[PDB]
Design a protein around this nucleic acid. Structure first.
Ligand code: ZN
Ligand code: ZN
Ligand code: ZN
Length: 87
DNA sequence: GAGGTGTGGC
DNA sequence: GCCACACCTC
């Protein structure tokens, strides 16, 4: 039940929220509103969370620490898969 | 691990 | 719109 349809070149992809469609439309337009501000870096991204992932390459930030060993991860889904190895 | 992206509470 | 969740593919 998706009411927000993409009307670009007969794409037809449909989403549940308008903000989802607006983000998808960037695949057709090449718009990248989220700019890395790291010194000397000119990378830009269509989604804010893609920029977050990029910043963690600059900072080495790994917020998701495994509570059963010393390993840490930049993303929760990486940790979740690793945790299965403990059980 | 990384890239891409569909989803939904707020 | 922000943000992280969740899943697929490589
Ligand atoms: Zn489209
Ligand atoms: Zn950067
Ligand atoms: Zn572990």
């Amino acid at each position: 039940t998706a009411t927000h349809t993409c009307d670009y070149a007969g794409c037809g992809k449909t989403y549940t929220k308008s903000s989802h469609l607006k983000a998808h439309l960037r695949t057709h337009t090449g718009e990248k509103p989220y700019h890395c501000d790291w010194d000397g870096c000119g990378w830009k991204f269509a989604r804010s969370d893609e920029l977050t992932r990029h910043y963690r390459k600059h900072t080495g930030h790994r917020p998701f620490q495994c509570q059963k060993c010393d390993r840490a991860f930049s993303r929760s889904d990486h940790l979740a898969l690793h945790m299965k190895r403990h059980f």
